[PDB]
């Protein structure tokens, strides 16, 4: 019968905290800081490089813009369809959502990475060429919203 005093943590799951400045035995009189200097008192900023031009300022900015109007698709490969729908049948967006192939409230695009050998009807937002050929090859249909 396990009681409240029979509860112990997993082996090695707790580790003793290292307390510095507690005598020369463990870490004394310096707490692992060495002798004097800037680092011996407060800190050194990451972006600082000693007065030489930093790597984050002497390099050209990455070219281009971001296109706030970009449309992004959550993708699903035909191999995932094959593995997750062995019996085939109707495949909609929320079937993939239930099967956990795509996120719940996003656009869906079907790609043709895997092997499709089951007659399957897929209704998505977009299809790649290889995905459409793979779906139609197995007798299925590839309609898009």
């Amino acid at each position: 019968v396990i009681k409240l005093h029979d509860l112990k943590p997993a082996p090695g799951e707790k580790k003793a905290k290292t307390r510095v400045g507690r005598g020369e035995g463990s870490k004394g009189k310096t707490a692992g800081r060495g002798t004097k200097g800037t680092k011996a008192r407060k800190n050194v900023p990451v972006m600082f490089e000693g007065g030489q031009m930093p790597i984050h300022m002497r390099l050209p900015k990455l070219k281009g813009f971001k296109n706030r109007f970009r449309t992004e698709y959550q993708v699903v490969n035909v191999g995932d369809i094959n593995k997750a729908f062995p019996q085939g049948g109707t495949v909609g967006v929320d079937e993939l959502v239930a099967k956990g192939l795509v996120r719940k409230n996003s656009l869906v695009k079907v790609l043709g990475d895997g092997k499709l050998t089951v007659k399957v009807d897929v209704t998505a937002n977009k299809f790649s060429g290889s995905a459409r050929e793979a779906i139609t090859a197995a007798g299925g249909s590839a309609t898009e919203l």
């Binding site: 019968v1 396990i2 009681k3 409240l4 029979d6 509860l7 112990k8 943590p9 997993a10 799951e13």
Partner: protein, 209 residues
């Protein structure tokens, strides 16, 4: 699959309650239960400890005396940490100790504690603690003595069972919990668990559904 036979305060068996395997037959996990109860106790603790730092002590807003010429050590304020009556450097401050344990861990720990209790047949089911409409601590104590001879017991009755809750309230080793408030710490702290029939059925229906 373990069977628990319902006992009545009259002393006769009433029926039986079927304990599902997934609720009363899981392998206890010592580390998981330890973490869960530690988080529970941390959530219980209130951090009402505070100390005044060098900036919150009264006064000390002026440099005391001449830095030089005195021949004494240089001081910037009379509230410095080295000064008697000065501020505290790293003192306790009000803080929250609660941990964000996932739901699955808590459920698994409670299931493990319940299964450990059931393995040694420390689970008992009753219809009512005492004859209804009037609390009676003597009758409840006698019934609990008949049920078990252990020191600490846990009584799980519904929030509407006022008579039983009042009856078993004053016993030194009896702790009263509601079926929806079951937790690892309360189960593990108790040698025996006494379930009301409606409370046990409510717990099983809530969990196994």
């Amino acid at each position: 699959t373990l069977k628990v036979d319902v006992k009545t305060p009259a002393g006769k068996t009433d029926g039986s309650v079927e304990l599902p395997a997934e609720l009363f037959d899981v392998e206890p996990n010592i580390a998981l239960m330890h973490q869960v109860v530690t988080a529970q106790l941390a959530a219980k603790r209130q951090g009402t400890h505070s100390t005044k730092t060098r900036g919150e002590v009264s006064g000390g807003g002026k440099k005391p005396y001449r830095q030089k010429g005195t021949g004494r050590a240089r001081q910037g304020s009379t509230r410095a940490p080295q000064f008697t009556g000065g501020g505290t450097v790293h003192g306790p401050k009000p803080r929250d100790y609660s941990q964000r344990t996932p739901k699955k861990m808590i459920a698994a720990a409670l299931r493990g504690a319940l299964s450990d209790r059931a393995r040694n047949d420390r689970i008992h089911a009753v219809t009512e603690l005492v004859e209804g409409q009037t609390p009676s601590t003597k009758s409840a104590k006698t019934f609990l003595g008949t049920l078990t001879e252990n020191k600490k017991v846990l009584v799980v009755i519904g929030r509407t069972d006022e008579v039983g809750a009042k009856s078993v309230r004053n016993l030194p080793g009896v702790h009263v919990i509601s079926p929806d408030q079951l937790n690892t710490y309360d189960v593990l702290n108790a040698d025996d668990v006494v379930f009301s029939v409606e409370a046990l059925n409510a717990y099983i229906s809530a969990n196994s559904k």
